[PDB]
Amino acid sequence: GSSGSSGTDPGAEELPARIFVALFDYDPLTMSPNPDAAEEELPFKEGQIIKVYGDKDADGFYRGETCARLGLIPCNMVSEIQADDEEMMDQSGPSSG
C-alpha cells in the first residue's frame, strides 16, 4: 500500500527498534554463496537505515526491517548509530556541588 519507511508521521509510541546504519553496500544476490539461503538475508546500501527488531541469533545477524523489507543483517557490515537524546555530561562545570 502506502505505509513503509516514511510518510505516516509519528502519532503514537511503539516498541523500541534499534537503528543501524549501513557501512557498505550489501548484495546477498552476488555476495552470498547461494541465492536460496540469501533470501534470509536483507540487502541494503551504505547509509541506509534498518529498523532492527530484537537481538541477533547465534550466527550473529541482526533481524531488522528496511525499505518495507524483512531479513537478516550482518552485524559486521552495518553498525550502531549514536544516541540522539541528550549526550553525557562532559567537562562538568567547575561549580561546587
Method: NMR
Query: Hey, is 92 helix, strand or coil?
Result: coil
Q: Kindly report the CATH class assigned to 17-81.
A: mainly beta
Helix-then-strand count for the chain, H and E = 1, 5
Cα 51 to chain centroid, rounded: 5
* Cell digits of residue 73: 543483517
How many other CB atoms are found less than 10 A from the CB of residue 50?
A: 23
What is the DSSP secondary structure assignment for residue 48, as one 8-state letter?
-
How far apart (Å, rounded) are the C-alpha atoms in residues 97 and 93? 10
Q: Is 32 exposed, middle or buried (0-12, 13-18, 19+ CB in 10 A)?
A: middle
- Residue 34 CA to residue 32 CA, distance in Å, equals 5
All cell numbers assigned to 79: 553498525
Q: Exposed, middle or buried: residue 26 (CB in 10 Å: 0-12, 13-18, 19+)?
A: buried
Q: Which helix (H) or strand (E) holds 79?
A: strand 79-80
